[PDB]
Design a protein around this ligand. Structure first.
Ligand SMILES: Cc1ccsc1CNc1cnn(C)c(=O)c1Cl
Length: 127
């Protein structure tokens, strides 16, 4: 079973903003997670072919990854911070739903999620 098309990172029909919260989401939140030692499995869409996960996209119908989020932030895809926060949460949720407690990938997601929560706890108020 092939990979699906990746999530959209460009859509000229979609209204966009550059906001201080979205800037924080790139400069602080994404940056922190991206540089982490456990970031690598999450830096691009799950390649179900290479990774021999033929049931992945049967189970996971809203795929998300930090490669996609990074592109969405750098290319100003979002209207608001909540959209981006939802993408991160979708990414973590997918990992927990597909895998089992104590799997390496789940421990990796937990570490990244801890940092995610720490950083969005201090999301600045809108300017
Ligand atoms: C590359 C790697 C590292 C530990 S397990 C694994 C392959 N499978 C993966 C990869 N990424 N993600 C997000 C998954 O949920 C699954 Cl199950």
């Amino acid at each position: 079973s092939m990979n699906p098309p990746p999530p959209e990172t460009s859509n000229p029909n979609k209204p966009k903003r550059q906001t201080n919260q979205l800037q924080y989401l790139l400069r602080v939140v994404l940056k922190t997670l991206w540089k982490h030692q456990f970031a690598w499995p999450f830096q691009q869409p799950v390649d179900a072919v290479k990774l021999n996960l033929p049931d992945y996209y049967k189970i996971i119908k809203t795929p998300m990854d930090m490669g996609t989020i990074k592109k969405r932030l750098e290319n100003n895809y979002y209207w608001n911070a909540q959209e981006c926060i939802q993408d991160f949460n979708t990414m973590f949720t997918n990992c927990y739903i597909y895998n089992k407690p104590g799997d390496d990938i789940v421990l990796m997601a937990e570490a990244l999620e801890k940092l995610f929560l720490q950083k969005i706890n201090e999301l600045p108020t809108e300017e």
